[model samples]
Target: PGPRVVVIGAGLAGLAAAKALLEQGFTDVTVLEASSHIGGRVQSVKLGHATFELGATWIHGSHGNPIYHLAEANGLLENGVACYLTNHGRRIPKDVVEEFSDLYNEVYNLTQEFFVNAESQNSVGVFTREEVRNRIRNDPDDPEATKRLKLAMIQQYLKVESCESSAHHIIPSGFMRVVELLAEGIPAHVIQLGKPVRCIHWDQASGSVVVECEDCELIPADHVIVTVSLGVLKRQYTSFFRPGLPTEKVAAIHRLGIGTTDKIFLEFEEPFWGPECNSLQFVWEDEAESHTLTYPPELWYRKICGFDVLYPPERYGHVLSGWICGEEALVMETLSDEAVAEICTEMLRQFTGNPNIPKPRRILRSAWGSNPYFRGSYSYTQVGSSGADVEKLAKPLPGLQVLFSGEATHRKYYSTTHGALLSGQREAARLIEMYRDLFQQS
Candidate 1:
């Protein structure tokens, strides 16, 4: 057996690292997962006859993405869209719909351009929902655009879920298969499920680490790989390390932003969005209006960025999901299922002006904001910090007894399953490089 290795969190990053270590001839590897299941935020649940992904649905970038290659190997159904959405049979006139779509595309490009430049700056940045609306209101290019109209448009197109600029693709089989595949070849006993690690006591002098679980059990390892979420690290780091994480690492973790983006799935006996439409988009006519922190229940539609329709009943059933991002996503977590369904249903009615829109027979949702194991969805670089923070976060400890790997640790690939997988393999290689003599001997 090689050096005893303990991997915390059996998420995509952890599982990938563990499997890579085994392949690198490290026989003594143990994976301690806080949750009873693997996959981390990449989870799928079944509602009625449909399979809905609660988290990490899309594999962004097909050409270079290993996750996409994996999906192809697994024979998962990969689909595309003609455009983000169509006007469809909504209440708005055809001419109005055409004008709104053009405006939305133009403004969205400007906003995205701004985001690209903003990331290059050294200071922290904030996305002022009100400011976005005001920018559109005073749009010199379109003086005719009304205040209410621009306000609605900004809310619709400018919402960010994961600080991602790349495109993402979905898997019909769900991402759980990828998790299971990542865990393949690793022994069952090597993975400890529901084993919540409360602290890691690492000895610099001895080049060893002791992982303490919530149950008072301790597992000692020659090297430890911590793959917990940045959200978890932000909350529990004070008490999670024996001597505490290095000041620089702590700063880097804080520099990174962990955000929540929830998906609310509405299932019906028959589809209301129509067959020609791939997605349902909103066009707000009021630029003067904005969202309040109170999140008044009546204005729930204001919070919904858009609805994505899952096509073909045989594959996904009759399902549509409304995406909610940022602080409001947490607010969505607070509401009861019934309240969300009612509010969302009313939102649909208001948009389509069709009173006949049937209430969802089944309601399934994701609350990534509230899950203690996650606390948030994914990581992004905040203001005042750049991708440098991610590289610093990934740097291995001096003694090689402690290592870090996760999507947040990658500069280019942060907030993706592919990033998580690559980071895990990266850390595994680091460990192997550290013990090249032993590895060669084995």
Candidate 2:
């Protein structure tokens, strides 16, 4: 029999680690999950015939993304289009929209370059706004209204990009289907649900680690892999681990940014948008600046950049997905569902130039920011933090007694499903190599 391995948090990272270990003939592996349900942030809810994803909506890109490959293998990918609408209830010309979009893309690429090269200690927001200002000033011949509209478009892009992705494909069946597929490879008994771990006691004289649970159950194991979200780590790390985490790890946790990007799903009795309208981009003509730190409670809904028309009427019905990010997302979570739906209805009516448009039949939303288990949506590079912080977070403790594996720990693909899975696999491989001598003798 191999050493007893206890994996904390049955999220993608935890489950993947358990699955990989089992595949390598590790017989005594156990996965502990705080929530009754598995999959963590990859949650999906069903409404009538349609599937609403409260978390993880896209597979990003298909070419090299493992999530995309898995979805492709399961035959679950769909494409869509988008239209630009102004706050004045007029659709912008496609030529104008495309021109601005191209400009935004150029600025975005430069921001990425700045991030990759570590050219400065500025935040992504700062770099992007500066580039946009430079470009706008260089081309000052455009009409004042047109210039204002361009700035509004850039502001909208910032919010939309907060959630993140590319050549994005939606799973018609539901994103949870992918999670289910991942869970299928592991035995049911290996995962313990609703077992929140409170503290980890490591570096014992016996060379074993003990995980203490909220219910006071102590689990001792030769190795323990913690796969909790970065949000959780930021909130609980000081007390959660005995002999507090190393100085570098704590610094990394504090440096990396984790912000909320929530979704509001509104299901209508019938379709209001045209067949070709896959997305509705909002442009606030009066707004000349891209950054507003805060908004009043009543104006929080304006932070929503736009609504995405859930495509293929045959599958998802007439559902529109609206996105909100940063502090505005946290505020939105405190409002009643009725208020959100009503406010969204007004916003939609104003943008589409149709005040008579009926309100949605019902609504569903995500409160990742407020949820205790997941305090925020995902991790990002903050002003002073870089990819190096991610590397520091991923490093295993001395003797490999306690290891860290999660999306936040991945340097290249942080805040992604593939990153979480790969991190899990990487840690499992670490243990497998450590026990290679025993396996060879066997």
Candidate 3:
């Protein structure tokens, strides 16, 4: 007998769809998850002395989200998150925090203004959303309105840098973030862990695609959904297409630049930055930017450093994660916990009055952006990237042979866990549309 259907990943997207199919009555559905578990990137850790997230930590867009509704129904969320911010080495002024949000909200809202103007002008190289990146970087040099816009971008980015800081970002509060690590015995059982995919062969003639995982079994099926992270795709960890991707697909992949965002978890005996310690951070001089990605060191956003003093404040954690954005995040990936902690210790000592801070009792870290299965935390399209790519990838191939879904596949709601859940449902529903035809044929 031939394979009826094979879902390439067992993450939330793959599992959700698979579960939905089983519920709706699709037997013999096989879900191939590269990682050991089903949650994909959504992992919450409470195993060690401290409680925190090791993966997709937030359920970003709660309102009107299906996953949000599910989390609410499951009675899983404890709502432990508190929103706070820090500048340099201490808590930032409340007014400054608001100033950052106001500017970000304004700039985000004004995106349409830029688009409408660009469309009216009829230019090919019209401004993209990432043009705002340049705007932010050049704020210190520009005049008046341009400067204000740039200033607003910086303030917004800074505050945002602090948004997911250690203070209240964790749950006991949010609905989308399932604080409870996915329980062992549940209706959803996912792919085995650490199994990275290696190659892909889509035979247009046979109307099938074969997936080869890194040192794992070769999975053959009628369709394939490549939900691996951008880092994996960028690094060419697996084969792209059977005869290789078309120029358009290749260009699309290149255009969809996957940024590297990682961290080093450092712990100390006692907090040295004073009583009001949240997520302390620095905005280094980013390397100079051209058409390519580059920013200065001092101003380039070294890391959003901080201590979670309140939640797991006692006994174990004086832990601080060295946050890295874009390429710098990947650079840090090359180091071990000791090296990362050592570097962060110096930074912390410099930030505080103490010149010699003690090493942490425990050290933890992440491979989100660089993990073979999860190439990065999530998706964020820069200047040239568009909302269209989200929908473009989500669309099921003709005949429902190949279906696409995940955070990256959702346009209006990419870079979020809620997006991940919803994308699964979207593709599942797409498959359901053909249920009758499939049933009859089978």
Candidate 4:
């Protein structure tokens, strides 16, 4: 018999860890999930005939990505296009949009290269901004308005990139399907739902850790893998572990950044945008020169980058998925759905120059920031934190009694489904290697 193992949180990371361990002949493994449901952040809801993803939506890049492979094998992936529209109700010319898009991609690539070699304590936003300004300075042929428009486009691009935090592809059936598929591989008895772990007492003299649950049910395990979200870790870490986390791990948690990027799904009675319109990119001309991070609560809706017209009218009907991020997203979470719907309708009307654009009949949005289990949407490399912090966050405690696995622990692929899955598998493999001799003896 293999050492008893406990996996915390039944998200992609936890589920994957449990699945991998069980597959490797581990007999006494258990997965304890805080929520009554599985798929922590990959939740999907059905609104009428269409499905809206309230959580993880994209597989990101297709090549070499495990999530993409699974999605592809299941025939759940789709491609879409984007249309750029300004707040002044002007549709940007295709030629200009393409030209600036190319420029932005070039600048983004250069910024990544700088990030690889540069030792400056600058954020990706600051570095990208400098590169964009330099490129704009070299181009002296365009009018001031055109230049301003380009800057606004770049700003819009930044928000979109932040939301992705990659080629972006979505699952048509919903990302929750992927979660279901992963769960299918593991035995039902191995997973215990709605069992929130209060604290993990590790490094015990008895040579086993005790998983203390909120319900007072204690489970002794030789090894425990924690797969909670960075947001949850940030909020509960001080009291969630016994003897406290190591100073380096605590410091890494503090330094790492997790921000919210929410989606608002609005279902209309009829279609307003053309069939070719897959997405609408909002460009703010007035705020072209202002790179202010803070926006007044009253104007939080302005932070909404734009809406993506849900593709395949037959499947999704006439629906628009709006993207908003940062502090604005947090404020938006506090408002009533009706209030958000009205604001979205007004914002769309102003951007499309169509006063006749009717308000959506139904609206659904995500409140990841407000959710207790997941305090924010995803993790990012903050100004103070580097890739090393991510590695520190993933480090296992001595004797492998406690291990960490999550998207935030992945240095290169943080805030991604593939990252979460891979992190889980990595920890599972660590345990497998440690018990290889026992497996061979058995």
Candidate 5:
């Protein structure tokens, strides 16, 4: 019999670990998920006869990226196309888009370079607002339009209000496909849904771990791979871990941040924007102060950078999605669906100067921040902390028989699905290597 393993979360990370273990001849692997379904943040829903992606929407980097490779192999990958148009429904000039793209690339590259070469201290964050803005703008006193556009672009690309942001790509077929594909090879019985893990009872002395569910079910294992979100770790770390996590581990958990980023899907039965339109961007006439905390029912629209036009009218049935992050996303979540629909309809009418713009027939969104299972969307580098904190969080407890695996555990690709996948495989391989050595010698 192979070594018994229990993987928590059943997200990409957890599923990847279970698959890797099975491939490595470990048959006794089981995946426990708190939710009734798979794909923690990679969720897709059907609304108005079309599939809507409520969670992860992108493949990010395409070339040599493991998740991209999976998309290609499964035929779910597509060239991510985005069009930036004004609230008036006029597409921005191609020249300006190209210039903005270049500026965006420069900021992205500089952040990576700075992190590698620049010396950072606990007192000071690695990237500063002034330093980043200075690099993006050629003029010290740039045009208000230029500054607003720059700020909008920063929100568009980074998925955060300020600081570092990276380049990303999307899966046109929906990210849920990728999550489903990752779980395809694994056996059905190996995955147990609605298994809300309450406490993990681990004894270092006995070299065993028992995962207890809220329903009083006890599933024991030789090793456990925790692939839960950083938000979950932050809120439930104390109660979840039996003897409590190590001090340094807890520090690392608190050091890394879990920012709330939400996607608002507005579905229409009839096409409003023309077939060629790919995106509708909202540029505030006045530059708004960017903040990390989002207050409910307060300037919710100002936080939104733009609405991405969900392509192929036949597939998504005239759906456009607005992106919001930070506390704004959290606040947006507290509002009712009808309230959101009304607000967006009025906002769209004002922007387009078309008072007759019809309200969305259906609205779908993600509430990751409020969900107890996943307290927030994904992980991020907080001020005064960096990838080193991620490394610290991933370090396994020696002789305690607990291994951590998730996107936050990955140093290079902290917020991507592929990072979560690779981290899970790494832990599984490491465990297999240890067991293989022991059995071989015996």
Candidate 6:
């Protein structure tokens, strides 16, 4: 038997790393997951008769996305995704669509120029695709035509930023996508569900690592891969190293601000919103924040509320999901789920011009921020959090032989599922190489 290699996560990267090792003829491997399932944060909910992706729904950048490739290989992409852009249950007018497409094309062409003028967005960090799209730079002094044109630009920016700001665009795969991939060949026992890790113990002298769970039981390993989400690390939901992570690693986690993205799912029976419509974005009555997106607050109208139309309007499914992020998510969290549902119902009625919108029978929500397993949807390089700090986050513990892998540990690809998976592979490869002298763990 080869030397024992213990993996600390059932997330995409962890599973992939373990799978690769197995393929390479390594035996005596143990994978510890804090969840009963292997997908990590990539989760799906069986609503009604069909399955809806509750986490990591869409695949971004089909051009180079491995998820798309895998889907194609496995026939999951047999049906090309059909995306619709709508507002308030009404189809975007043809004129608006034309204008939006033109604006997006022009602005996208100027992406490289963002550095010269995108301080408002990028000043904090590389504004994810969503941030870039949703950013509206309004100036009352502008010409009427210029102002209209700029508004379109901001709209496009917000649309892009919505995805970028999400766990989706920040990195290649990130939260949900990785789990879907990891769930394929991973074993359930290898995944430790509902057990939040409290501490990491390692001894460099003997080349061993141990993780303590809430039960205080210790999980020991010859080598360990810490695959917990970056948010958990930043929140200190779990501890690393008995002596404490080297000062540098601790400092890096502190510097990287863990943010959040959430979606509220609403299912109604009548489908009053209608069929053929897949999504909607309700504009606050007067565009109060001018696309910057302030909540309804005391305003007569609410902010932009989103919705998604599920397949088969009359069948066993109909879902309208409201997406919230950053400060918006924080504010929404303050309200009870029922209250938020009421507010969303009101906005749908106001925007769709349908006063009779029915109350949804079911409400589904994501609790990543409050989830101990994952503090936030991974880590985004916040403003002032230099890209170089990623090294500090990923820095292997000296003498302890502990390596880290997750979306946050990756810089350019941070917040991406691909980044997390890749980091896992990186750690596995390192362990294999480090154990070459013994010639068994390979």
Residue 364 accuracy (lDDT) in model 3 = 71
Candidate 1: list runs displaced more than 4 Å: 77-90, 94-147, 160-168, 204-207, 283-301, 437-442
Q: What is candidate 4's CA lDDT for residue 214?
A: 92
lDDT against the true structure, per candidate, is 0.75, 0.84, 0.55, 0.85, 0.75, 0.62
How would you encode candidate 2's per-residue C-alpha lDDT over 33-146 as one tens digit per residue? 999998898998988777888888777785788778878888877655587889889988887778787877788777877674233634555677767766875785777767
lDDT tens per residue, model 3, 1-442: 4335666676667666666665676665666667665576766555355555666655544447665566657665541321233223333445544654564556555654655321332231223325555555556644453343334335335433432321112354332245232222224443345556677666545436666767867776765555555555556722555556545545555665455566556666776655544455432222122222333443333434334443355633666655566655666776777776776676666545366678777777777766767777776654466655555556565566567677677766676666666677777777777776767899
Q: What TM-score against the true fold does each predicted structure earn? A: 0.86, 0.90, 0.73, 0.89, 0.82, 0.76
Clashes of 3: 30
Pairwise TM-score winner, candidates 3 and 4? 4
Candidate with maximal TM-score: 2
Per-residue alpha-carbon lDDT of candidate 5 for residues 2-62, written as tens digits (9 for 90 to 100):
5678898999899898989998889888888999999898888876467677777677775
Best by lDDT: 4
Please provide, for model 4 over 299-414, each residue's C-alpha lDDT reduced to its tens digit, 9 standing for 90 to 100: 89877788888767789888898888888999999999889989888888888889999878888899999888889988887866788899999999988999999899987888
Report backbone clashes per prediction: 12, 0, 30, 0, 4, 26
Q: Model 3 TM-score?
A: 0.73
lDDT of 6 at 25: 65
Q: Which stretches of candidate 6 lie over 4 Å from their true place?
A: 61-66, 79-163, 166-189, 204-207, 274-278, 285-305, 311-316, 331-337, 437-442
List residue ranges in candidate 3 displaced over 4 A: 1-3, 47-49, 61-63, 79-195, 204-209, 283-312, 438-442
TM-score of 4: 0.89
The C-alpha stretches of model 4 lying farther than 4 A from their native spots are 61-64, 69-81, 95-99, 102-148, 166-169, 205-207, 437-442
Question: Model 1 lDDT vs. the true structure?
Answer: 0.75
RMSD of each: 4.2, 2.9, 6.7, 3.1, 4.5, 5.9
User: What is the Cα-based lDDT of residue 434 in candidate 5?
Assistant: 90
